[PDB]
């Protein structure tokens, strides 16, 4: 097996052709497509852009909320000059459950809507001809998948997603689909670990190939070689290394090659930032110095396109995060497109990487009969995420769950499995966390013991004791924080969520909940609490921007806790954060 | 700005809007209004259902230790409201409670005192009613038997089975109506409340709850049910205009179920209601 | 070797997209060329392509930058392409472009809305990476399309001063594609349709840069239905399935150069068979009258400016179908080819418009730079018709938007361009232009050249709005009585009418800027349209709110959209849906 999660690159040995554009599309309400031969051509179809969720193109709700099997189809050319090479199709992701057919032959299956996979087609494609690519997708939710939920059936027989999570169940092909030509012997993986030294830095590496020819690794500052090594394991000695820092990124160029004499059998290239990250004495140390995390929980969410990758929106989001003085964000509730991490690497932003283990909430959750099948799917996602993302300088922590019912029996065995795995799989041994739900308190949470740092999602002053009660909210908040003080045992804490829904058009004096003035007051109270406790070492606000949810009486066209609108313009709270975050030192509270 | 203060400019605008939209009736939802509002109803020819502030009556409510003292305050309010308003041509019925827990033990004793009193005090013996909460069903309400006509407050498609569930909301609404048909004993029914919160600035296609398109679709679904049942003889929508509530996660600067904004300007739904209500004859369904 | 054909992959051709994150730098001092920036930017930021650069930034100075700026990327040329011609296609580059590869300047282009190629066969290194550097300039002048001025602020910074009502978005707005092509290749082809008793016949021409034999084959699906040899010929299609409004049918055309048993080059494309002509004051599509209904659009969306985004295109078409439109005009510049491909597939009619907007104030067409403007106008008309002529959806050419056609010099300028459009278009489709409010039946020197008249009128908005709307209708009806006397049996459509409308505003009774006023305005205008037999189409301004330069009249851009910029309906969208889906396709087609 030649599994590889490496980003597709063009090199002397590798080719890449994007298959994005307008595809053919059809719902399959009776699940008849396979036996009816739809993999060889849809009888009826519409056009559908890839990448994008399908939901928000339509003007009818039945299509927006379709839940079941659906098909994507396109034709791709395979140049004849590729005939010596391995041929594969990379899917950045496909949501949620995928079956891939090429020329009518089923060539791949995949579980989980937010991580990449390849379909090898070397012996199925016709060369110098067009070939049919058919993708049978399904977007139904069940209780043993990431993310977790249910599928209901309406009184008219129609299926509808019923998530256990607070975001719309967007599905489709959300990320670029890329046809690749690869040499039969090739680099499948590599890893880097960094060490600071008196003369500079040292990068310890491994490379994994599917063959035995010789491996070299060269490191370049621009076009100037600064270090090289031979062998699948080694050390790169970088004199006076230029370290990657917050808002001061520096990226070297790594070149990995397989050699057969004077012939280069395979070349893989990628940017690499050199930096250390670790928890010591209740602080996050980046290159040996403390950093106070500030930023957001985000979503892959925008108007029209659902979760589809859009480099324009990504660019605007980073411009806004720099303007506001953020330095960190969490990939709230699923791994993002690789491109978002690539830009974080360039811009000097810190990332907490999170698998889609959200909705594990109300017998308690971790005693359900399906817990073993869920754990399997969870290990798979955790493995692929760490494998895909481990070499990004920007990625500094792993978040293993969001708001699980960690008061349930069965929590310890479940968490121990996954937290050990995260330790095993990450060569850099980055810290591990999970977002603690409101119902899980210092005194009853069976899961908090496993985290290297505690991440709280708290809504004191919104879901509890909002409005005129915010005085009581603050007192109840401090009460819980005194509880955490007794179980932390020197570990740091961050907030991964806090926020208040806010209509971007709403002004009131005095404030009311849903007004911009209330949002500012809400945030000031929370920051007063944060600043009161030595062990609070970061604040990520919920959310960067307004985003879509299922309809309900609580959701005024989606979630309105954004600091920015869905159109990436600031609410009043954006200027409050800008004043706070740009005025706190990078090492705020670093001596506490 | 003025809260509940009387302001004849606003009253005048409210009547201009009710005439424009084709309304003929309103209920004094949750408390008796200032006299001037009934005087204008008399001048313009509107029907009024007069309601005392017996709202919030959530051990069941009517087994509480303070029930005797509540009843005494309720008797006084009913007496002064009928005493003050009985001579208005516009006032044509008495609403004695809004959404009491009329499944509670002790409901019958409390209701009988008050409904008997309303009969004794009114020289014109106008019909008596109360707004029935959603949890009070044909098969478990101990209070509906007292009403001369039934007034339902229903939110099928808002609080219950909203959004993509509206198809289920309509089915459950019809089933419950089928159950009311068996207890009405020939009495008429009106809806005193139905509605959906709507930001006056929100448009979406397809609709989402809180959009003006959802408000229109919600109203259409409900009207289709109303029109299916011969015994439905009136429809009062909640609410005429956005109004202030206590702060809360459910209230985007107060209640937004208004057909008009708090500034007395129409949302899309006002044009839906204008087209419907001005097209129905005054005696719509009068032979059914 | 000029060719405006859409880049395709075939047995002889390769295409690799260069879209993604590029490097970018402003060049405020215009120093980059002499400073060797083409071999690498000293300082740079990342920038998505395709997109406008403007709306990413948080500072106004960057959003409003006017001058030289650079885009750069590295691109791989596979060694297996040796022997092929290597070219980089730019869908567009706004406004004035100089292209460098490995430090060598290989192309220049004028005009920000039409494609061009940079041939780099002998400049690139094979099986290696090469540096692509793009020096762009977005300054406006009075002799370009579109027209404007570039002002200098008191701090010395330049700022665009358009003579047109849309923001001066610039950047690389459309896909950049690297191509490998055979040295002898198809450069162009044209089709021309005729209906017959037995089906349809397609008269074609093909242009190549060589002498080897040419064949043309037409396939229904995979099923060949016609073929022919020669650079000119006819394809006989029995029982031809015609392309129709909201009912498209597309055949596949395959053009090949042959050298014995070898296919030297192959080009493929979809083609819809249909006729379109003006007869007795009506638009005839496949011989039957069509009443045009729809919009003026823009290439405009949140964040990306005029950047191509298939997601927004798909939504726009879903909304146009939902509302009952059948037609739009490419308001004030040719759009990305992808929009026309979708119109071919969905059965939408398009009026293709060149960026000849801003020609207004000695009168405009007596300005000293008039001959320079005309030359740029001819090139854009040449490239637009050459690019778009084989689209079944394209059924008319708009040669200008609101020129001062009352000016001296109008006749000689217009004749040149209306004659040229016939020389450029084998199908001889109807030609028009959008007539400004100040140009009336009795004083317009331009209107006589149009095959159908297109009016932009704002009776009830810019003229006699509000309580004056009763006078606006009377003045409108008088002007229409005047047009009746000069039409000479020609049809008329409205290409613009509309009223700015905040999507949040309700008032009873209406005020200008409220949704109720927008509805009343449209009702008044439609009452007038329906009073005149010669009105054969209505295109409202605009499909969606779009960005303009800042100003007291522009509440964050133009608010005349029927949809918001986020593609949600205002009240008037429901008004149009009820009207446009109630009108028969051949509405007013017998009068
Ligand atoms: O919601 C958000 O914005 C985001 O927050 C996170 N999660 C936080 C907790 N969570 C809730 N979501 N919705 N409602 C409530 C909670 S908890 C809670 N507790 C409540 N009471 C506690 C006991 O005393 C009285 C108050 C009440 C309510 C809620 C709402 C109904 C009435 C009272 C799920 C989402 C998610 O990580 C994030 O993906 C999501 O977007
Ligand atoms: O609310 C209005 O606009 C107006 O309506 C009337 N009253 C209607 C019912 N009433 C409610 N107020 N707020 N929330 C709920 C109800 S009932 C209900 N049922 C619910 N579930 C029941 C079981 O099945 C599924 C649905 C849920 C909720 C509510 C809210 C949280 C989510 C689930 C009190 C006010 C008042 O006469 C009026 O003065 C007031 O202004
Ligand atoms: O504007 C739009 O929305 C769109 O319309 C088209 N164009 C139409 C006319 N045009 C104008 N733009 N702005 N203002 C005026 C005009 S004409 C006119 N005439 C006026 N008076 C003439 C003499 O009698 C009394 C009325 C007055 C005004 C205007 C403005 C101030 C009040 C008096 C240029 C743009 C463009 O093709 C389109 O790209 C643009 O987006």
Residue numbers in the entry:
A (entry chain D): 2 to 363, 379 to 608
B (entry chain C): 305 to 362, 379 to 608
C (entry chain B): 3 to 363, 379 to 608
Tell me what the authors wrote about this structure, in their words.
Because intestinal β-glucuronidase (GUS) enzymes have been shown to convert a wide range of glucuronidated metabolites to their corresponding aglycones, we hypothesize that gut microbial GUS orthologs would catalyze the conversion of TSC-G to TCS. The human and mouse gut microbiome have been shown to contain hundreds of unique gut microbial GUS enzymes, which exhibit distinct substrate specificities toward varying glucuronides. Previous studies have shown that microbial GUS enzymes can be categorized into seven distinct clades based on active site architecture and/or cofactor binding. Our central finding is that specific gut microbial enzymes, notably, gut microbial GUS proteins of the Loop 1 and FMN-binding clades, mediate the colonic reactivation of TCS from its inactive glucuronide metabolite, and in doing so they drive the gut toxicity of TCS.
We focused on F. prausnitzii 2-L1 (Fp2-L1) GUS, which was the most active Loop 1 GUS protein identified from our in vitro enzymatic assays. The crystal structure of Fp2-L1 GUS was determined and refined to 2.2 Å resolution and reveals a protein tetramer with a GUS inhibitor UNC10201652 (GUSi) covalently linked to glucuronic acid in each active site. Fp2-L1 GUS was crystallized in the presence of GUSi and the reporter substrate p-nitrophenyl-glucuronide. GUSi has been shown to intercept the GUS catalytic cycle and produce the covalent GUSi-glucuronic acid adduct observed here and described previously. Using the Schrödinger molecular modeling suite, we docked TCS-G into the active site of Fp2-L1 GUS and found that Y479 and three methionines (M454, 455, and 362) are positioned to potentially contact TCS-G. Mutation of Y479 or M362 to alanine significantly reduced TCS-G processing, while mutation of M454 or M455 to alanine significantly increased TCS-G processing, perhaps by reducing steric occlusion during TCS-G turnover. We confirmed by circular dichroism that the mutant proteins did not exhibit significant structural changes compared to the wild-type enzyme, indicating that the mutations are directly responsible for the observed loss of activity with TCS-G. Furthermore, methionines 362 and 455 are unique to Fp2-L1 GUS compared to another Loop 1 GUS enzyme, E. coli GUS, that we show poorly utilizes TCS-G as a substrate (see the alignment of Fp2-L1 GUS and E. coli GUS in Supplementary Fig. S8). First, we tested the effect of GUSi on TCS-G processing in vitro and found that it inhibited the conversion of TCS-G to TCS by purified Fp2-L1 GUS enzyme, as well as several other Loop 1 GUS enzymes, in a dose-dependent manner, with IC50 values of 0.64–4.9 µM. Thus, taken together, the in vitro activity and coupled proteomic data support the conclusion that Loop 1 gut microbial GUS enzymes appear to be important drivers of TCS-G processing.
